Amino acid sequence: PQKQIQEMKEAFSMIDVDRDGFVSKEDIKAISEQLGRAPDDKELTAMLKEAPGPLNFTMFLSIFSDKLSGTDSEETIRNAFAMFDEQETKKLNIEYIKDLLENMGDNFNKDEMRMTFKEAPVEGGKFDYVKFTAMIKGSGEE
Amino acid sequence: KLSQDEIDDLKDVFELFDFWDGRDGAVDAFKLGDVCRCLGINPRNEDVFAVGGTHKMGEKSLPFEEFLPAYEGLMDCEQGTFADYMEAFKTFDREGQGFISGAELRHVLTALGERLSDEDVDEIIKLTDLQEDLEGNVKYEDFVKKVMAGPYP
Amino acid sequence: FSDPDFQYLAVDRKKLMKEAFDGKKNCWVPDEKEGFASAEIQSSKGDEITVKIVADSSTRTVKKDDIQSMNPPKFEKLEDMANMTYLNEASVLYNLRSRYTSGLIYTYSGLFCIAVNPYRRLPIYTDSVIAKYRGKRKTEIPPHLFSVADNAYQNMVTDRENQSCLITGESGAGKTENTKKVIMYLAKVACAVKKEGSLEDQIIQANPVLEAYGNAKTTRNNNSSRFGKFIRIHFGPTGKIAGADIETYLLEKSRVTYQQSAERNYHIFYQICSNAIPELNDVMLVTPDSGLYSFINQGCLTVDNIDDVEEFKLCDEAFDILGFTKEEKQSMFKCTASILHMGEMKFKQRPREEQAESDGTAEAEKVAFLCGINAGDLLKALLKPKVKVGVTKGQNMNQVVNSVGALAKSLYDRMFNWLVRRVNKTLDTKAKRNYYIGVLDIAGFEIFDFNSFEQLCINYTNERLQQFFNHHMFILEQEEYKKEGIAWEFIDFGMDLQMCIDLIEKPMGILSILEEECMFPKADDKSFQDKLYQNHMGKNRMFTRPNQGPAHFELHHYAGNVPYSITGWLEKNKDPINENVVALLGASKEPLVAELFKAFQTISAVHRESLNKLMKNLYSTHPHFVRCIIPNELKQPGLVDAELVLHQLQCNGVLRKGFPSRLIYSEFKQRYSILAPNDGKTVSEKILAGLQMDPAEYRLGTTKVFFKAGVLGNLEEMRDERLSKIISMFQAHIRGYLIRKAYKKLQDQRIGLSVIQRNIRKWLVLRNWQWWKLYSKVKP
Ligand SMILES: Nc1ncnc2c1ncn2[C@@H]1O[C@H](COP(=O)(O)OP(=O)(O)OP(O)(O)=S)[C@@H](O)[C@H]1O
Ligand SMILES: *[C@H](C[C@H](O)Nc1ccc(N2C(=O)C[C@@H](*)C2=O)cc1)C(=O)O
Ligand SMILES: [Ca+2]
Ligand SMILES: [Mg+2]
Ligand SMILES: [Mg+2]
Known part of the structure; x- marks a missing residue:
């Protein structure tokens, strides 16, 4: 979490159009419109209450540290997969991990199943959980 | 009966099987016998059925207040002493030295009694490491010892 | 001794010398050709001992059971075969057979005097022989009919009793020839001293x-x-x-x-x-x-x-x-x-x-x-x-x-x-x-395709001699009942045989009928087939066939059931x-x-007596049985018809009937220790005792141990079954071993999966958080 902060501010400048110090409820509808699919009214409104008080940056880095609490190391994650790859292939036969989720531990529910594999780096029946974890949260690019 | 600490060996293992077939608070009947083994036991096939149990995963899900009373049974049933096994195997040893030919082992383990699985036997060997001499025979006595012992000596 | 001109009535010389034996490799196995064959077990795979034919060096397969156990080159061509360590349904042949191909033609083998038809007048009957067997007992001189009489002589004179000398076998087995030689022998020895x-x-x-x-x-x-x-x-x-x-x-x-x-x-x-x-x-x-x-x-x-x-x-x-x-x-x-x-x-x-x-x-x-x-x-x-x-x-x-x-x-x-x-x-x-x-x-029993009155006779007359031998054979046990001292006075056998004898001759029996159904010219064979079934139908125990013909009622005899036909019986019963x-x-x-x-209105009336006489005369003569056997139907000497002899054997003394069974305490160890797997007699001694063995089904002796009815069999099952249950516990134990091995990973992965499954389940929720998308949206 350090260098990320430096990149955070960058994410703070773009949002803060008028540089009104903060992210006015309007500063959001800003870049988003000038950039994407502007969220619904309430979507915006109830998007601020997520933070205790008027968001400067500290409150910006705040609401962002919560949704990143239980982040098991990329290693523990990639090492959690290979725990099934009893052959050191850094890979899993798709139909495997597939059934290994939808029917194991907690019934990966249908929906959550799809939304995942949608981008699944699968190829040739294989499944590089390595590159997938590297993508699930981590190295790669921004 | 059983001891709280003993059941702690059942509680810990149960929530571990119900987990693999989905945490719903119920374990697959067929998977039941394979569970009871996780407690220093070796109940017979027929027996494991005498207390519920199934084959294809999808017959009955057992909960707990019912899973336990089942262990209560497959606990007053017969275990094979070093003797029994020895006396049995002997009923296949003609020479005397106490050696059993190769094929035969993989044969008796399948043919007679209750064949279990080509793989299995091939695993029980590849595992507890039993090597055939340079003729074609293994001293069963020395084998049956390894099985009785357990994978973790 | 030496070797005068004993070349046939003596198991001559040292063929007993040169050459190679194991209580396992070697044994007897079935064979459609020459009966049984010598083999060398080359592999054992459970219930199918795989062996090899030592003759043509072939390699067939035979079930453990069907296999027979071979005797060592010790008892080779033995005399009183009873001595063989093995006296089974196959061991008997190897000996007698090797003997017939030697012109031996004599083996007392136990308590008998087996003698196969040679079909070639032998020289082993000269006076030199006769004299060579004068007074000699039986355990020194080579085996031969002769001595069978010299013994039946002193076992007479010295015993102040009487001696009978029956000769069993089939037909043409050579009895009404040896009976001649037994007469001639008694002649050439004890002598009394144009016309006569x-x-x-x-x-x-x-x-x-x-x-x-x-x-x-x-x-x-x-x-x-x-x-x-x-x-x-x-x-x-x-x-x-x-x-x-x-x-x-x-x-x-x-x-x-x-x-x-x-x-x-x-x-x-x-x-x-x-x-x-x-x-x-x-x-x-x-x-x-x-x-x-x-x-x-x-x-x-x-x-x-x-x-x-x-x-x-x-x-x-x-x-x-x-x-x-x-x-x-x-x-x-x-x-x-x-x-x-x-x-x-x-x-x-x-x-x-x-x-x-x-x-x-x-x-x-x-x-x-x-x-x-x-x-x-x-x-x-x-x-x-x-x-x-x-x-x-x-x-x-x-x-x-x-x-x-x-x-x-x-x-x-x-x-x-x-x-x-x-x-x-x-x-x-x-x-x-x-x-x-x-x-x-x-000639004894005979079962032609079409059985008539004459057959009823010959068979009946022969089934009365049975109760004789079968009786004079029970005594021989009630003597090794004592040597092993057990006294099984808890047996009422031998009467089942009196189901035909009694019936066949009693004052109300068939002979009693066909003997009275003539005191009137109303000899209607239909009035006979009835009167018979009007007195002996469905009361006792006697009433399809190929190439077999016509018959009216059978008779559960001994060597089988004879389907009798009373067709035209009356007239045949007289002149x-x-x-x-x-x-x-x-x-x-x-x-x-x-x-x-x-x-005495004839021929039931001549035989119902002639036989009564013979019988009530023999039961006063110490017997001396002799069994004859025919080598081949071709009646040409030197050959042995495997299946033939074997048969002739299972009618005489290959023992038996519905007596107990005895088994050496030593052998009892191996096929019965497993029933209580928890030395000698001492070993078993407890097993049965603890097995709560219905204590009426046995009597422990000194030679070995005795059982009542086919019980050893009754036990055998308790084995075949139990023994298998052992294999079960084992295999089941093997299963209980594998699971343990994987339980480490079966529990180790538990946390492994719980990692991914929860990591992603928390990754999606993030990719669906307004702010984040916003952040990623802005990744300049
Ligand atoms: N010891 C022997 N030596 C030489 N030839 C014999 C011998 N025994 C039998 N044979 C021959 O076989 C024949 C038939 O034997 P028999 O003694 O007549 O038969 P059997 O046993 O009396 O027949 P059954 O039962 O009355 S049909 C004799 O006539 C001989 O030719
Ligand atoms: C021989 C006929 C033959 O060999 N078959 C049989 C012999 C003996 C028996 N037994 C007994 O010995 C007692 C009861 C029984 O069934 C049956 C058949 C002959 O010609 O004598
Ligand atoms: Ca479950
Ligand atoms: Mg601003
Ligand atoms: Mg004759």
Whole structure:
């Protein structure tokens, strides 16, 4: 979490159009419109209450540290997969991990199943959980 | 009966099987016998059925207040002493030295009694490491010892 | 000893020397060819011991069970086989067989005296031999019939009792030949010292007679005995033969006029017409062809190794020395040749209506001369019988052509009767008898395709001897019941055998019926088939077949069930001779005839006694059994028909019946330790005791241990099953071993999956958080 902060501010400048110090409820509808699919009214409104008080940056880095609490190391994650790859292939036969989720531990529910594999780096029946974890949260690019 | 600490060996293992077939608070009947083994036991096939149990995963899900009373049974049933096994195997040893030919082992383990699985036997060997001499025979006595012992000596 | 000229009656030399044996590799296995075969186990895969045929070095497979256990080259060609470590259904063959191919022909093997037919007159009977077996006991001199008598001699003299000497086997097994040699032996030893016999040659010579009258060449062999015999030799205080007396039984009377095929009517007929006594033909009006007389020219007319000529010449001399006279001797043949012509009295289906008619007269007339009486009264009363009810009758074509086939028959029988009678007279010396020895020779049970009254007899008569041997065999145990001291006075066996004997002869039995159902001409075979089933149907235990024919009721006998057919039984039970003839002949000129027809309603009434006699006489004679066996149907010596011998064995002494079973305490270890897997007798001692063994099903002995009924079998199951349950616990144990091994990972992965499954389940929620998208949206 350090260098990320430096990149955070960058994410703070773009949002803060008028540089009104903060992210006015309007500063959001800003870049988003000038950039994407502007969220619904309430979507915006109830998007601020997520933070205790008027968001400067500290409150910006705040609401962002919560949704990143239980982040098991990329290693523990990639090492959690290979725990099934009893052959050191850094890979899993798709139909495997597939059934290994939808029917194991907690019934990966249908929906959550799809939304995942949608981008699944699968190829040739294989499944590089390595590159997938590297993508699930981590190295790669921004 | 059983001891709280003993059941702690059942509680810990149960929530571990119900987990693999989905945490719903119920374990697959067929998977039941394979569970009871996780407690220093070796109940017979027929027996494991005498207390519920199934084959294809999808017959009955057992909960707990019912899973336990089942262990209560497959606990007053017969275990094979070093003797029994020895006396049995002997009923296949003609020479005397106490050696059993190769094929035969993989044969008796399948043919007679209750064949279990080509793989299995091939695993029980590849595992507890039993090597055939340079003729074609293994001293069963020395084998049956390894099985009785357990994978973790 | 040495080696005089013992070359056959002795298991000569050192073939016992050079060369290779294991209680396992070597053993006996089934074989469609030569019975069983020697092999070398080359691999064991559970219930299918794989072996290899040592002969052609082949490699077949045989189930553990079916395998047989081979004896070591020690007991090779043993004598009293009882000594073999192995005396099973296969071990017996290897020995006896190797012996037959050596011309050994003798093995006492246990308590018997087995002897296979050689089919080649052996030299092992010379006086040198006879003498070599004088007084000798039985455990030093090589095994042979002889000694079987020398022992049956001192086991007599010294025992002040009586000795019987039965000879079992099948037909042609060679009994009515060894019975001869046993007679000859007793002759050549204990002696008493133009015209007559030497009272040896008086007995020994009395053979070709009853043989050339009772023995006929039948498909089986060539000198088959068609009549029972029980010669008894008496002994005086000086332990010397003082008396003889023969005893015949059921004779094949239907043979007199019929020979299905490849058979010859009773010998004499074939020799009377051989022209052996040219100066006699014109005394029987016989001209020799015996291919010319319908009555004996049916079957084959000349067996291959029998020279009727000498067979007759000798048969001639026999009578002389036997104590006969010109008359007697001649008279005999006369009534003998008579029958020959008696079957040459052609007849005519006369009335174009259906009546009585003479065809020629020239022949028949000749018969009237031989027998005596006038052809007139004869051919006359032969066609117009006169036998009232205290009137005259009329016979048809059959009632006459089928009439002679009664006269002539009934004659031979009567003749034979007087024949033996005559003989037993010339050799009954009213001397001083003290104890008699005795041999009995009569083919045993027989189960033809179509069983008739005659069969009922032969079988019945044979099933009475069984209760004898079977009884004198129970004693032999109630003696090794003591050696092992257990006294099984908890057995009521032996009566089940009295289910046929009793029934078959009791005052209400079949013989009692067919013997009374004649006291009235109402001989309706239908009124018989009923009356029988009106008294013995569904009460007791006796009532499809291939190539088998017609039958009315069976009889759970011993060697099997004989489907009897009472069809035309009554008339067969006696002589349907036109009394017109009888009385007529009963006044003839020839003494033989008259006496044969001079003046107990017959033949159940002759056998229900003759047998009672024999039996109630044997049960007073210490027995000496001898079993004969036929090597081959080809009757050519040197060969052994595997399946053949084997069979003949499972009827005699291969033991047994429904007695207990005994098993050495040593062996008991291996096939029964496993039933209580938790030395000797001591070992088992507890097992059963702890097994709560119904304590009435056993009696522990000193040699070994005894069980009651097929229980060892009852146990065997407790094994085959239990033993398997062990394998189960093991395999089940193997399963309980694997799981453990994986339980580490089965629990280790638990956390592994819980990692991903929860990491992603928390990753998506993030990719669906307004802010984040916003952040990623801005990733400049
Ligand atoms: N010991 C022997 N030595 C030489 N040839 C023998 C011997 N025993 C039997 N044979 C021959 O086999 C024949 C038939 O034997 P028999 O003694 O007549 O038979 P069997 O046992 O009396 O027959 P059954 O039971 O009355 S049909 C004899 O006539 C001989 O040719
Ligand atoms: C031999 C016929 C033959 O070999 N078969 C049988 C022999 C014995 C038996 N037994 C017994 O011995 C007792 C009861 C029984 O069934 C049956 C068949 C012959 O010709 O004597
Ligand atoms: Ca579950
Ligand atoms: Mg701003
Ligand atoms: Mg005979």
